[PDB]
Design a binder for this molecule. Structure first.
Ligand SMILES: [Ca+2]
Ligand SMILES: [Ca+2]
Lengths: 543, 543
């Protein structure tokens, strides 16, 4: 295509600068000032990355020469930047506070977002206040969200992350996998007379959600033995109005899903109602507002001071020039235990693409594996490989300055460990240092010589630390939005469509064919199987 | 060193075979028979890997030429194969059923394993039966395990994985992170008078566990106001007898940790007592027995029919010849939700090493990133990248033929999806196939031509499927042991020490120094900081 090539020959010459982090911090008393940014109460420290002024300048020039400035405007204005589906990409509009005019494919987006939020707010208030009653007349005590992917991970992550803010006296449960263990974990602990279930399914056709929904309905009706009970116990987030009505849900309680909201960008929409059912609508608004803060930052700030742009440039630089194939994300807070899982979908489902916008196969690597784990626990699981393995892996740390309790010694130790692990990545420890330490420990020269090489830690390994003041609805919204925009920037620089997901279609089709084969070994489906699939089906049956 | 080089020039010539999976299954009606194995009720299907007879033969010859045969014997016989620490590696002995003579560094390992298991069995029986009373005289209802890493992940994973088998009427809770949110999640839901806490800490010196232990003790004593209450409410798994006694624990209730049991191989030892507290000791014995079954398989079976050897060869072949830097593990069962987290420690902390046994820096890649996620959920998160990204990633699927409920339609759909995803990886879908499908869907030629390239799925991507009959204590033990031995084989072929973890020491040291600096900005520690660490500490304080 005619697009600027990001991963070009010039990028390799940047890495020949041979950056040594210890030397840079020693020589440059402005290093932190140069390579850190603030947005409100988020501090973004990228100074332990393998950059200097020349490398950063070069990368920023690539951003400036690219289509990025135009693409940011196009996203926010509702241009159809999801070019394979001919759709706008307007998750930003879900959290807008600017109130500027936005008319897209005939709809006043401001009015439609606002009116839908009012419907959800009113639902949550009616349920929490006890005005909503189940079919036997009882107040609701439990909410069960039924959805998968986009319709599960964001709500589940946010509900956990904001646990200190739970305030509705409702318990919220998440059913997702078609594996019935998921449904059963909820059903074992809820009462049909006091439970409200949410079916989150755009087309009412996602297989797992359909089976879970039907099985939930059967459970409810086994209790009540009256079809009319569905209306008091189920709501839907769907566009498939006929199937929602056929299930027995009142269309007053069918909530909107717009085509310009990708599933993996949908927690901000009515899909997030389970968040509001846990933390109340006021806190859901604060979540939205935090994201807006970052949207305004991203939209308005010159690239050299723009956090998501810097995040994207660093990531793409590493995966281009060091040929790295993964990135580690290390949240140093228990509350963020589903954060990595959530961003795996946002990042990998967006940028795991092999063709550009024009449909040409690209000759450079695109999205890499995102993985990681909560700290300090990861220090005792996989940090060994981060320190002494021989895989190049960029590392992001998320630190939270203050927690939600008064165990101040624990919080101090948590932070000290976070900072110590980035410092260890930067400095390492050399043979001479180790050898001298072993002698001082009481080993003799022979013993110290035999052991020291095994303790050497190469160091000079990069990291970024993102420090939040606290983990509140607002700050979490800001955090998630930073990564949403990082992912957007990377897709623009790689000239891919971050907003489609055609790769998942084949497995859905093959799954239907295999289900048919499992039920009828005379079928064309069974006959056409590869023999691996055929013998796996046989092993299952002859159990 | 003089060791055989696994990642040599020959390995590249194997990949020039240009294996095409579809063509192989079409041409070779023995493909599944050749490239599958059974161990009891586990079926191991590696036939969708990028191999043929010649490649597999070549790889097996490398195993046969290596030190592997000798090293397997040395492991089981108690030779000090952890050569940097001068230790035996005898997690196998923890689950032995052979009863053969084993005398290692003066101890009769058979007697010591058996006598310790009897102590744990008796503890669990005394607590579950109600004979154990808290300091106010009440029966125990809750167990809180306090540990991190090796002293947390295995027990936590197993307790969840075997949830259908819980039978003691005790609720078991896991406290690990120094982040006090971990401790608080347990303390919020337990009563000091009815809780028994386990301190799992080899030296009673692991920082997080020490802070958690002290804070738990303070909670207990805030209630009772009598130091004597500790003895009725705490047990320890530790070798540091003086510190255990000083804490107030009876040495009758200090359980053994042998130096030949690595933390990441320790769930089989007394460290696993929390498993027994959930599922009973009889089920813990079944877990052990399943692992023994695989130990006997591994120890006795020729390499061409040896599941862990084949697993190891395939993995190391890919990361050598395709230069892949990660592996995906996809368990198609909700119960296995912590399985990936557990194996990340077993694999990465073992094989993330940069020097060989002789201490020389190796010129080949060693352990890679292990990641993944439960199916079918991952299909809606990251499988897009597995199908259409441009990263080479080997894939393992774990399938369970029968579950623990009678929602047979759900179980069938779960399996059909599992098999469909490996079939999709193998076959993909070409431009012509897609284009014709789009025309049949009602698109015109222009529209179909514009879209088709975006739907192409390259295919020819490898996978292994491991099918268990059911997920029972025994089968789970077998499953974990298969991966333990895979990891061992890979470390032998790479001539590294899989059983040390020197890389984690530096961060512990730096963490102590940073704690001092956070408490005193006049200290040498604060003065010596890099300015990134210094400014992060400042941002925390001026919050
Ligand atoms: Ca420009
Ligand atoms: Ca031989």
């Amino acid at each position: 295509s005619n697009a600027m090539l990001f991963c070009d020959d010039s990028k390799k010459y940047l890495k020949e600068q041979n950056i040594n982090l210890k030397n840079e911090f020693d020589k440059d008393d402005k290093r932190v000032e140069k390579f850190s940014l603030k947005h409100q109460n988020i501090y973004f420290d990228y100074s332990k990355n393998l950059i200097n002024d020349y490398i950063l300048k070069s990368l920023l020039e690539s951003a400036e020469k690219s289509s990025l400035k135009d693409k940011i405007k196009q996203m926010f204005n509702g241009a159809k930047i999801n070019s394979t589906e001919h759709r706008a990409v307007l998750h930003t509009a879900l959290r807008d506070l600017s109130s500027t005019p936005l008319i897209v494919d005939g709809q006043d987006i401001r009015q439609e977002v606002t009116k839908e939020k009012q419907r959800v707010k009113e639902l949550v208030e009616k349920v929490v206040s006890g005005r909503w009653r189940g079919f036997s007349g009882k107040k609701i005590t439990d909410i069960v969200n039924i959805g998968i992917g986009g319709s599960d991970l964001g709500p589940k992550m946010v509900v956990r992350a904001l646990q200190p803010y739970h305030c509705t006296d409702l318990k919220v449960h998440f059913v997702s996998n078609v594996d019935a263990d998921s449904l059963l974990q909820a059903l074992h602990v809820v009462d049909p007379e006091t439970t409200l279930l949410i079916i989150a399914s755009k087309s009412f056709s996602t297989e797992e959600t359909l089976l879970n929904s039907i099985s939930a309905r059967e459970w409810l009706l086994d209790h009540y033995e009256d079809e009319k009970a569905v209306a008091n116990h189920f709501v839907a987030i769907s566009s498939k109005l006929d199937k929602v009505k056929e299930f027995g849900i009142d269309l007053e309680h069918c909530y909107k899903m717009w085509d310009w909201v990708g599933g993996r960008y949908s927690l901000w929409s009515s899909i997030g109602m389970s968040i509001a059912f846990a933390i109340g609508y006021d806190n859901f608004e604060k979540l939205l507002a935090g994201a807006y803060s970052v949207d305004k930052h991203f939209k308005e700030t010159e690239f050299s001071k723009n956090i998501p742009v810097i995040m994207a440039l660093l990531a793409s630089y590493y995966s281009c020039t060091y040929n790295s194939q993964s990135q580690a994300l290390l949240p140093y807070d228990e509350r963020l235990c589903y954060f990595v899982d959530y961003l795996q979908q946002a990042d990998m489902e967006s940028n795991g693409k092999s063709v550009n916008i024009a449909g040409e196969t690209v000759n450079y690597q695109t999205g890499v594996v995102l993985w990681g784990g909560v700290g300090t626990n990861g220090q005792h699981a996989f940090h060994q490989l981060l320190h002494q393995g021989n895989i190049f892996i960029p590392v992001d740390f998320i630190a939270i300055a203050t927690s939600h309790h008064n165990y101040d010694n624990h919080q101090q130790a948590l932070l000290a460990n976070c900072f110590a692990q980035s410092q260890a990545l930067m400095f390492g420890q050399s043979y001479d240092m180790v050898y001298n330490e072993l002698l001082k420990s009481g080993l003799n020269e022979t013993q110290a010589k035999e052991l020291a090489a095994h303790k050497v830690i190469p160091g000079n390994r990069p990291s970024t630390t993102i420090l939040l003041d606290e983990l509140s609805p607002y700050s979490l919204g800001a955090l998630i939005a930073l990564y949403e925009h990082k992912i957007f920037v990377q897709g623009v620089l790689w000239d891919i469509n971050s907003y489609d997901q055609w790769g998942v279609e084949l497995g859905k089709k093959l799954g239907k064919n295999i289900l048919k084969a499992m039920n009828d070994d005379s079928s064309d489906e069974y006959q056409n199987l590869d023999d691996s699939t055929r013998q796996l089906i046989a092993k299952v049956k002859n159990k």
